[PDB]
Design an enzyme around this catalytic site. Structure first.
Site, PDB file in Angstrom:
ATOM      1  N   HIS A   1       0.802  -1.217   0.000  1.00 21.80           N
ATOM      2  CA  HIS A   1       0.000   0.000   0.000  1.00 21.80           C
ATOM      3  C   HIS A   1       0.847   1.286   0.000  1.00 21.80           C
ATOM      4  O   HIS A   1       0.270   2.382   0.097  1.00 21.80           O
ATOM      5  CB  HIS A   1      -0.995  -0.009   1.159  1.00 21.80           C
TER       6      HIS A   1
ATOM      7  N   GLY B   1       4.168   6.040   9.792  1.00 24.62           N
ATOM      8  CA  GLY B   1       5.456   5.918   9.164  1.00 24.62           C
ATOM      9  C   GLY B   1       6.198   4.651   9.503  1.00 24.62           C
ATOM     10  O   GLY B   1       7.253   4.382   8.904  1.00 24.62           O
TER      11      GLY B   1
ATOM     12  N   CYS C   1       5.232   1.553   9.009  1.00 22.80           N
ATOM     13  CA  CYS C   1       4.970   0.403   8.151  1.00 22.80           C
ATOM     14  C   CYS C   1       6.227  -0.039   7.421  1.00 22.80           C
ATOM     15  O   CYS C   1       7.060   0.780   7.025  1.00 22.80           O
ATOM     16  CB  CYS C   1       3.882   0.735   7.151  1.00 22.80           C
TER      17      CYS C   1
HETATM   18  C1  LIG Z   1       1.889   2.478   8.298  1.00 21.48           C
HETATM   19  O1  LIG Z   1       2.931   3.292   8.724  1.00 21.48           O
HETATM   20  C2  LIG Z   1       1.326   2.961   6.967  1.00 21.48           C
HETATM   21  N1  LIG Z   1       0.799   4.219   6.780  1.00 21.48           N
HETATM   22  C3  LIG Z   1       0.335   4.395   5.428  1.00 21.48           C
HETATM   23  C4  LIG Z   1      -0.249   5.594   4.935  1.00 21.48           C
HETATM   24  C5  LIG Z   1      -0.673   5.662   3.620  1.00 21.48           C
HETATM   25  C6  LIG Z   1      -0.512   4.548   2.785  1.00 21.48           C
HETATM   26  C7  LIG Z   1       0.072   3.367   3.278  1.00 21.48           C
HETATM   27  C8  LIG Z   1       0.503   3.291   4.616  1.00 21.48           C
HETATM   28  S1  LIG Z   1       1.233   2.111   5.574  1.00 21.48           S
HETATM   29  C9  LIG Z   1       0.719   2.674   9.253  1.00 21.48           C
HETATM   30  C10 LIG Z   1       1.064   2.272  10.657  1.00 21.48           C
HETATM   31  C11 LIG Z   1      -0.053   2.657  11.619  1.00 21.48           C
HETATM   32  C12 LIG Z   1      -0.457   4.042  11.566  1.00 21.48           C
HETATM   33  C13 LIG Z   1      -1.281   4.440  12.688  1.00 21.48           C
HETATM   34  C14 LIG Z   1      -0.468   4.410  13.926  1.00 21.48           C
HETATM   35  N2  LIG Z   1       0.141   3.032  14.211  1.00 21.48           N
HETATM   36  C15 LIG Z   1       0.370   2.105  13.039  1.00 21.48           C
HETATM   37  O2  LIG Z   1       0.792   1.018  13.186  1.00 21.48           O
HETATM   38  N3  LIG Z   1      -0.312   1.805   8.693  1.00 21.48           N
HETATM   39  C16 LIG Z   1      -1.651   2.314   8.389  1.00 21.48           C
HETATM   40  O3  LIG Z   1      -1.986   3.428   8.626  1.00 21.48           O
HETATM   41  C17 LIG Z   1      -2.608   1.291   7.725  1.00 21.48           C
HETATM   42  C18 LIG Z   1      -2.251   1.344   6.237  1.00 21.48           C
HETATM   43  C19 LIG Z   1      -3.471   1.019   5.366  1.00 21.48           C
HETATM   44  C20 LIG Z   1      -3.342   0.237   4.177  1.00 21.48           C
HETATM   45  C21 LIG Z   1      -4.471  -0.017   3.403  1.00 21.48           C
HETATM   46  C22 LIG Z   1      -5.718   0.493   3.829  1.00 21.48           C
HETATM   47  C23 LIG Z   1      -5.837   1.240   5.008  1.00 21.48           C
HETATM   48  C24 LIG Z   1      -4.688   1.517   5.771  1.00 21.48           C
HETATM   49  C25 LIG Z   1      -4.760   2.339   7.065  1.00 21.48           C
HETATM   50  N4  LIG Z   1      -3.969   1.680   8.090  1.00 21.48           N
HETATM   51  C26 LIG Z   1      -4.400   1.357   9.426  1.00 21.48           C
HETATM   52  O4  LIG Z   1      -3.605   0.810  10.130  1.00 21.48           O
HETATM   53  C27 LIG Z   1      -5.804   1.735   9.937  1.00 21.48           C
HETATM   54  N5  LIG Z   1      -6.308   0.581  10.648  1.00 21.48           N
HETATM   55  C28 LIG Z   1      -7.378  -0.181  10.063  1.00 21.48           C
HETATM   56  O5  LIG Z   1      -7.851   0.126   9.017  1.00 21.48           O
HETATM   57  C29 LIG Z   1      -7.865  -1.406  10.824  1.00 21.48           C
HETATM   58  F1  LIG Z   1      -6.838  -2.299  10.854  1.00 21.48           F
HETATM   59  F2  LIG Z   1      -8.945  -1.944  10.162  1.00 21.48           F
HETATM   60  F3  LIG Z   1      -8.166  -1.079  12.104  1.00 21.48           F
HETATM   61  C30 LIG Z   1      -5.730   2.993  10.823  1.00 21.48           C
HETATM   62  C31 LIG Z   1      -5.128   4.126  10.015  1.00 21.48           C
HETATM   63  C32 LIG Z   1      -4.934   2.806  12.105  1.00 21.48           C
HETATM   64  C33 LIG Z   1      -7.161   3.370  11.246  1.00 21.48           C
END
Ligand SMILES: *[C@@](O)(c1nc2ccccc2s1)[C@H](C[C@@H]1CCCNC1=O)NC(=O)[C@@H]1Cc2ccccc2CN1C(=O)[C@@H](NC(=O)C(F)(F)F)C(C)(C)C
Ligand SMILES: *[C@@](O)(c1nc2ccccc2s1)[C@H](C[C@@H]1CCCNC1=O)NC(=O)[C@@H]1Cc2ccccc2CN1C(=O)[C@@H](NC(=O)C(F)(F)F)C(C)(C)C
Ligand code: NA
Ligand code: NA
Lengths: 306, 306
Positions: free
Chosen positions: B41, B143, B145
């Site tokens: 992603h 950030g 991920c």
């Molecule tokens: C990781 O750093 C990523 N951020 C992004 C931003 C844009 C594109 C791709 C990625 S990967 C991030 C880590 C998270 C961030 C919140 C704080 N703690 C963390 O561990 N991952 C992230 O935000 C993922 C990425 C993603 C990929 C595809 C669709 C949707 C999302 C959002 N996302 C989530 O983790 C979300 N959680 C959920 O959707 C749930 F798992 F269903 F709960 C949320 C942003 C935390 C709500």
């Protein structure tokens, strides 16, 4: 989200670990430029631990009596000297992996990471605090002496601890990298005991702020307190006094959460007097005091190191 | 003496971390030989997270659309492909710091170390367990991920986890290095929730053995139990069943302490039914389940890695 006891990445220190053998004793050393640093009691023998005469033991050693190995390569010792409770062994090869580094003497209440090593090989890394009584609550076995503690800032490794001794309560004592013990401890087999310890109040507050940042808020009450009235309570529960410098150091966490330090102090007061009544904070049923304000900021803001 | 939540030395993994940027998204990648592995992603945009069509998004990207940086050096991408939920970016330079490595899919109940990274730069290291509900209790910010989890055995790094998602309870979800999620989770912004978690019984027992090894023995009682009678109690307190394989895996710790596994089970039964009554075990007021038997042996015997 989440909050873990997080250590610094250890790679810069791993490249500095060597083993030092003198006679039958083997321990770890720290190889920086063309010097290996290690505890001086590598020159001791078993019958003579009650009160070693280190100067007399060392005068009977020559360079060749020290066997220094970096991985599977022997490093030739070309000079040696004693500084306080450490030996400095000059070697024929400068460590090509020497990081940018400093030697620092840390203050009680501050934290560092320990790279536990045996026979010059790293085993694991964990975070420790320098306790108010100048001990650390480490995890160290026979052979761990010479393992080091450190902090990393941007690109610079600040070495602050070298491991020497285990004290009766299962806690640990050691030196800065100039070989001066933290606390009143000595490198002899004698009666030594940790003084009574206290809880690091500013760190508990930092950790309560970490809890709020992570959404764990149940313990926040509606009250406030004065610094003096808070410290009268802290004293009763064997917490250290909170200073205005501590209040100011907590400023960034107070601003991030919107909770004034003295308001957090009111909430901590109630936790001390009433307990948690079966609840947890950040997964703990006890109040945690080995995260500094800077540790909390680092972990809740993502500080990295080159 | 002492017992800490200890992580593996991180140096071998630090040398593999890079940053990957596609459009406006930046995350971490893992650089091994001439391939960079990262979450797919990185190709997504903000408006299109509810249900991304990853194949359609990727067909509009070329090699030059991926900006890969190892420290301050750009790595030219010369090929790309998607495997499950990861991208494999082939680069023009093989990582000269590639360790001996394996990709492994770990089992619920097993532990690993996480090297948390931001913008390709390591921030810290900590130990995690794969929970029975296929989440991990991590510490991850925006950030993070692409940060990875791993174990080290002798000289070999076994990569087991790559970070993708945060779930509502503040817990985390990710994939193996083939890009298959642990658990039922998906990389879309949908309603997903961790299933109900359970406590890892064999690990609690390992930790009670660690306590005995360290001299913390107050909870040992004079009784014994059968495996079946123990498991009826474990069930009530949301502990997982203890198997004969688990009993045998605990054999080394049972032999070291002289306490039969079923006798330790009798002591754990009493702790579950009666609580600790204000006492601690290894400094905790709760029962800890994120140390495996092997973790305890490693830490109480000094296992190192080359
Ligand atoms: C990781 O750093 C990523 N951020 C992004 C931003 C844009 C594109 C791709 C990625 S990967 C991030 C880590 C998270 C961030 C919140 C704080 N703690 C963390 O561990 N991952 C992230 O935000 C993922 C990425 C993603 C990929 C595809 C669709 C949707 C999302 C959002 N996302 C989530 O983790 C979300 N959680 C959920 O959707 C749930 F798992 F269903 F709960 C949320 C942003 C935390 C709500
Ligand atoms: C460290 O690995 C060293 N072992 C030796 C063995 C022979 C010579 C030199 C050294 S350094 C070891 C680490 C310890 C070991 C026990 C388990 N956990 C640890 O942290 N240090 C060690 O044994 C020191 C070294 C030393 C130096 C000079 C005189 C006496 C000793 C013994 N010693 C102790 O730590 C002892 N503790 C004390 O004497 C006390 F601090 F006063 F409590 C003891 C062996 C633990 C009883
Ligand atoms: Na308050
Ligand atoms: Na028993």
């Amino acid at each position: 989200s989440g909050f873990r006891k997080m250590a610094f990445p250890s790679g810069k220190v791993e490249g500095c670990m060597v083993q030092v053998t003198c006679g039958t004793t083997t321990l770890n050393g720290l190889w920086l430029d063309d010097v290996v640093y290690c505890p001086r009691h590598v020159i001791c023998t078993s019958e003579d631990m009650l009160n070693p005469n280190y100067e007399d033991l060392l005068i009977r050693k020559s360079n060749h009596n020290f066997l220094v190995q970096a991985g599977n390569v022997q490093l030739r010792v070309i000079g040696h000297s004693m500084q306080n409770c450490v030996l400095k062994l000059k070697v024929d090869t400068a460590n090509p992996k020497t990081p940018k580094y400093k030697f620092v003497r840390i203050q009680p209440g501050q934290t560092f990471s320990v790279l536990a090593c045996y026979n010059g090989s790293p085993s694991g890394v964990y975070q420790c605090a320098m306790r108010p009584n100048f001990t650390i609550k480490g995890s160290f076995l026979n052979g761990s002496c010479g393992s080091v503690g450190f902090n990393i800032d941007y690109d610079c490794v600040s070495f602050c601890y070298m491991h020497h001794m285990e004290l009766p309560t299962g806690v640990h004592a050691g030196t800065d990298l100039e070989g001066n013990f933290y606390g009143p401890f000595v490198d002899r087999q004698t009666a030594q005991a940790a003084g009574t310890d206290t809880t690091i109040t500013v760190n508990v507050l930092a950790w309560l702020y970490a809890a709020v940042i992570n959404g764990d808020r149940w313990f926040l009450n509606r009250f406030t307190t004065t610094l003096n009235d808070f410290n009268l309570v802290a004293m009763k529960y064997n917490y250290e006094p909170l200073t205005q410098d501590h209040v100011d150091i907590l400023g960034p966490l107070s601003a991030q959460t919107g909770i004034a330090v003295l308001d957090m102090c009111a909430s901590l007061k109630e936790l001390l007097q009433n307990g948690m009544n079966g609840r947890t904070i950040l997964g703990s049923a006890l109040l945690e005091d080995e995260f500094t304000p800077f540790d909390v900021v680092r972990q809740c803001s993502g500080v990295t190191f080159q």
